[PDB]
Amino acid sequence: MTEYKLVVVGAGGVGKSALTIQLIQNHFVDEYDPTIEDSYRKQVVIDGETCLLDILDTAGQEEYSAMRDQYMRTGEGFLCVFAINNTKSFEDIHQYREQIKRVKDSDDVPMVLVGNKCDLAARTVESRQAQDLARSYGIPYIETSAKTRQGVEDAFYTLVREIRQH
Amino acid sequence: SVPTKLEVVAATPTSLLISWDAPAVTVFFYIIAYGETGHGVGAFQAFRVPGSKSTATISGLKPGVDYTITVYARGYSKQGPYKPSPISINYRT
Ligand SMILES: Nc1nc2c(ncn2[C@@H]2O[C@H](COP(=O)(O)OP(=O)(O)OP(O)(O)=S)[C@@H](O)[C@H]2O)c(=O)[nH]1
Ligand SMILES: [Mg+2]
């Protein structure tokens, strides 16, 4: 059975753990428990093809170079997550991508840009800015709510499709 | 709770300099979280600082607004993951 090693990366508090737990266990974690490192494995069927998702839920960036370099080397695809109420989380995306490209030695890495917390009223990052960034990288952009499940399955399955089509 | 003695040491209408007492164990990193007092789930911002720090600046705040600030310590020990309960304070402006 094919395995996909997915790595969720982004600033602290943007919803990486809540998005992962919604995909894998189908419930919303409302408590904030900052992550050190967590792995999730689940057998799924995507577009009729059975696979195992091995998802690494990482501590918030910026991580120590030595640790970040290890999961960027082994990751096959990256969910780059910001929160639409955190402009710093959005601005930091560019350097996360540059670091993944440097470790992979490739400008073509399977990646999806995720704008999370799209259920919140008071947004500080516009969709237009994020769509323009994702287009500049040639990668998909999707807005998600771990709370309502809007876009969650689409974001992870889109990342698996990016790996399969690489 | 870890760390201890969380306080605002300097404030402007848009910024807070916060300070805390490090525990007597090695901390890998801290998370600083801030939002309006009584905010709904997810309605906050957070950033990571290295475990060597015992201060942080929070910027881009609205003048005359009540904020809740929370600090989490994270790391490892002989016992396993180090995930103590956070410490919080409230501060206006
Ligand atoms: N309203 C809302 N809240 C969310 C959403 N996603 C996550 N949250 C909330 O924000 C908080 C942080 O989410 P979490 O998944 O723990 O962040 P994280 O990115 O894993 O944080 P870290 O481990 O890097 S420090 C939690 O209280 C969670 O319930 C969302 O889509 N909408
Ligand atoms: Mg987490």
Author numbering:
A (entry chain E): 1 to 166
B (entry chain F): 3 to 95
Task: Show the paper's wording.
Activating mutations in the RAS genes are frequently present in human tumors, and these RAS mutants play important roles in oncogenic transformation. Here, we report a monobody, termed 12VC1, that recognizes the active state of both KRAS(G12V) and KRAS(G12C) up to 400-times more tightly than wild-type KRAS. The crystal structures reveal that 12VC1 recognizes the mutations through a shallow pocket, and 12VC1 competes against RAS-effector interaction. When expressed as a genetically encoded reagent, it potently inhibited RAS-mediated signaling in HEK293 cells overexpressing EGFP-KRAS(G12V) and -KRAS(G12C) but not EGFP-KRAS(G12D). Together, these results demonstrate that 12VC1 is a highly selective, noncovalent inhibitor of KRAS(G12V) and KRAS(G12C).
A comparison of the 12VC1–HRAS(G12C) structure with the structure of 12VC1 bound to HRAS(WT) would allow us to conclusively differentiate the two possibility. However, we did not obtain crystals of the 12VC1–HRAS(WT) complex, probably due to its low-affinity interaction. Thus, we improved the affinity of 12VC1 to the wild type by mutating the residues that formed the pocket that “sensed” G12C (V33, A48, and K50) and by incorporating the T35A mutation that improved the overall affinity to RAS. The resulting clone, termed 12VC3, had improved affinity to wild-type RAS, although it still retained 90-fold selectivity to G12C, and enabled us to determine the crystal structure of its complex with HRAS(WT) at 1.98 Å resolution. Similar degrees of differences in side-chain orientations were also observed in other crystal structures of HRAS(WT), thus eliminating side-chain orientation as a main energetic contributor to the high selectivity of 12VC1 for the RAS mutants.
